[PDB]
Design a protein around this ligand. Sequence first.
Ligand code: GTR
Ligand code: ADA
Ligand code: CL
Ligand code: NA
Length: 694
Amino acid sequence: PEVNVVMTGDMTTRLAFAGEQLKQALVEKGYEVNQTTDEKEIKRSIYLNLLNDTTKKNKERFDISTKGKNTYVTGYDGNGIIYGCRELIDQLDQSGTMDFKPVSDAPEMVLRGACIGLQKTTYLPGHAVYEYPYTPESFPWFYDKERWIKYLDMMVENRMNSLYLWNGHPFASLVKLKDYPFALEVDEETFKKNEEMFSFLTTEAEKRGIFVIQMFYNIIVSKPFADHYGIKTQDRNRPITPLISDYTRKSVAAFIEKYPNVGLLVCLGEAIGTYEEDVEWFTKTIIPGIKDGLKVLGRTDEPPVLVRAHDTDCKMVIDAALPLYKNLYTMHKYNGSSLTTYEPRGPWAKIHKDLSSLGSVHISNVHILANLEPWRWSSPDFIQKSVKAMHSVHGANALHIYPQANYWDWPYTADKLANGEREEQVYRDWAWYKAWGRYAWKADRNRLEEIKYWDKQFGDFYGIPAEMADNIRIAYEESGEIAPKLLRRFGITEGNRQTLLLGMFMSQFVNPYKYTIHYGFYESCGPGGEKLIEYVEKEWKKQPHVGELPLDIINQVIEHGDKAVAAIDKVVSSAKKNSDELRRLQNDMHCYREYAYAFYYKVKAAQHVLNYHWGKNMDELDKAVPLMEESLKHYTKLVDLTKDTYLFANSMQTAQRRIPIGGDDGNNKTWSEMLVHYKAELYNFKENIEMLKD
Ligand SMILES: O=C(O)[C@H]1O[C@@H](O)[C@H](O)[C@@H](O)[C@H]1O
Ligand SMILES: O=C(O)[C@H]1O[C@H](O)[C@H](O)[C@@H](O)[C@H]1O
Ligand SMILES: [Cl-]
Ligand code: NA
């Protein structure tokens, strides 16, 4: 049939994009589309009306009404019209028809976005941590315009309005300083490509209602700057110097001037020695450079500057900066560098609440996902309860998500495909982005309706009836509890210093404090409860148990694993689309189940070892041995499941990875390597037992 798309109001880039998305989606569903503004032609019509203003009240709001063959979309701003068209397109995909239900809606969280890291699995030669110039050699994908469009369209589809680029020192790839011409860290040809890609990225983001934000760490200078002056690129023990202050102030002023719509996300770390130096750097170097740039542009607005809480005293920094610059946003990790709970609490919740209490935008950062690497994860139930806690426990009104896994190896997942081919994170992790977007838009959605929604999404992706597709949801929601529960109850850290899914040594259960556990982790990252060492000590001292108990958690986790496997195994014979991906999701569920069993058996071994330390009964060490053997049988099966299907587990392939073992020079990033260590663990344990009897 013939359909009119009628764009009224002053034509803006976002109204044009909205109308073109609607046109393209109508044509895909087989309609003929007339784009017209003529009363004489305007037969079946959709009117896109963009309103002028309406202030914070109506930010990103749309109204859809229908009277028979006519549909009216009112967008309160450019994002609103884009989201109104999204609502129609979502309805057109779910039905197959232009029978539209009226909707009036607007997002709960005011910034909803994801990050890409201009980062790699290992350091570049001559460079320290986080230091990567923007070059085609390091980041060929950064220069791929077709890849950017696919990424930005995924962000619009999930109603995300913010994209963050993470880099240690981006300025020396992006701006030239006449006072420090030698500082530039890329050749002229690459400098011109970087300018073009920034102009492309900001233009394509802008028409999609996406705020581009450049993240930078401090204090870091370019390699050629450092070599010119005979100094280090970065040194936490190096105090603020006038020279480095001037370079950085001018770098920041140049960036503001050259890329006037790009936000800044400031980390006052990890190369600043003290909180007083954090404040001094932010208030006397960065803010003056931002003000310098705005003054060059003749701008009297204060666009938002975003400040991380990470490695600083965020409240102390904001309290000092607010007199100089009013428009400050905060950001703080949701569960440190992992995803552990939808019941956060404790001292880290109090940092959230104190930043939330400034009455600005406080951004929850779902950061790094150390405990999820590298297997598929995207539990609608877990993500919904987490966003609810972001509101109810943290007072966050905004969301920043990392990639679900494999942050340091963008744009690919850790999957090993048959071809030598790499799997795209955008393709694999579609439900991660979709779920975070969905709940950031609206957290309180009826759970029975959400089950129907997700059953249909999974069913459509795999060409399975919604009813059969319920097994895909169950696999995600059962498997999704495993890495969060095990890390919070037995982890050394929520940091990427640990790679949970490579497993743990029995010693890390028996003597966890040897491996350095920081205050705040156990106190913040889930329900109150007992470590295995605490549980066993209380058993011997006949003290009552309180909270989340470790033997309860390993029991729940093996049930999660078995239920995930049972669910996903029911659908593989049925999938008519994306079958090869379904086979990889099936394999990931078998990985989680073998992982859970290996973990279960090793914790039970550790309990016997702790019983020996308290009571000195040798029978306890004899009981531990067959449990460590069953642990190794499950871990051996996990190696067989990962051998042909994963490149590695941790994407941060450096000596900063300590748990379960050192990751120096990219070693011990595979289950195969860890099986060598765990065999030796068993042989060494049996030797210790023989020595103690003799
Ligand atoms: O490795 C670790 O344990 C630590 O890493 C630090 O960067 C972080 O600020 C801590 O919360 C902790 O996760
Ligand atoms: O928050 C941050 O920037 C950092 O936090 C931890 O130190 C983590 O090990 C780093 O890899 C980085 O993610
Ligand atoms: Cl943060
Ligand atoms: Na700091």
